[PDB]
Design a protein around this ligand. Sequence first.
Ligand SMILES: *[C@@H]1CCOC(=O)c2c(O)cc(O)cc2OCC[C@H](O)[C@H](O)C(=O)C1
Length: 342
Amino acid sequence: PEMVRGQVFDVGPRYTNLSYIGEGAYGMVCSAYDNLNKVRVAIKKISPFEHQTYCQRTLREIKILLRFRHENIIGINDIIRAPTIEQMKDVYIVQDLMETDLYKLLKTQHLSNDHICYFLYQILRGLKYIHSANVLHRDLKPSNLLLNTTCDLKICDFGLARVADPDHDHTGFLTEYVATRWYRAPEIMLNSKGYTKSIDIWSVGCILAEMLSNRPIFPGKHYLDQLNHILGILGSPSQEDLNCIINLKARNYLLSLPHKNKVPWNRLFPNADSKALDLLDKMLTFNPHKRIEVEQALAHPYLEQYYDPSDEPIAEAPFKFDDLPKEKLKELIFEETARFQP
Ligand SMILES: *[C@@H]1CCOC(=O)c2c(O)cc(O)cc2OCC[C@H](O)[C@H](O)C(=O)C1
């Protein structure tokens, strides 16, 4: 049984010659040689079975990814686990081996405008498919975007995904939220549970800004500070957009703030393509009802060299799926992974 950096990675004998890559949520990611297909692959170790929310995230991702099939979504090629529930302690997910992720790339590489445009196209193309299944990714960020050696992009990690539920999106002010802080839409902190598609478009807008400058556009340090960063750039919301926020605590918090001027996008990004900044503005719109939707974004002039709706496929059907004890959830993970046995 091979080990990498002092930890057991029990995937043989099909997968050998392991090398560290990085970290998933419940375990590390390695590369390995696939002795059957004769190519190196990526493998993620998942040890979820102690914690019920861990089991939730693992099951959710497996259920979605076994149904999804799209060029810009990384799939599941194989799942490795013990033959019996009694013996199963870890699960290993085998996926295509990519070359890097966008978080790592942006730490040292400046992107040409042609790279930015192609990455953004591919993000939106994958997102079109996800949203067409009535699913929200809910944690889009550079570390969840993988790139191969020719800059083809795939979206990773559906562990926070949910079915869209816009009729039950409303909540109170300062409602706690799980997804990554820097990519949270402003309404998360005001009145939203993040159950509508507009939550993902905001995150893509954050990713676009970060590709233009190699730095996060809104790097808040804590829950409410994230909103201060956003308002520091967008400026104060209009009366119309405030009137859309019926919750009094949220509205009165915004009314308590001094007026803030909008920072022009071309001041923040003086080298950027003007069409890219127009699309950026529409993705980083404060009012989620006015925010651009994924199919509109694909049709934006910035993406004209790539846009082709006949080559931007959608899901066959809407996706349908916690008080579930982890013992039922481990049982459910066991059953969901049976198709890859032996
Ligand atoms: C994605 C989990 C799968 O990640 C990978 O397959 C992966 C490959 O193939 C190559 C490289 O360079 C990195 C990879 O993932 C790193 C981890 C990733 O950023 C994220 O944390 C995930 O776990 C989601």
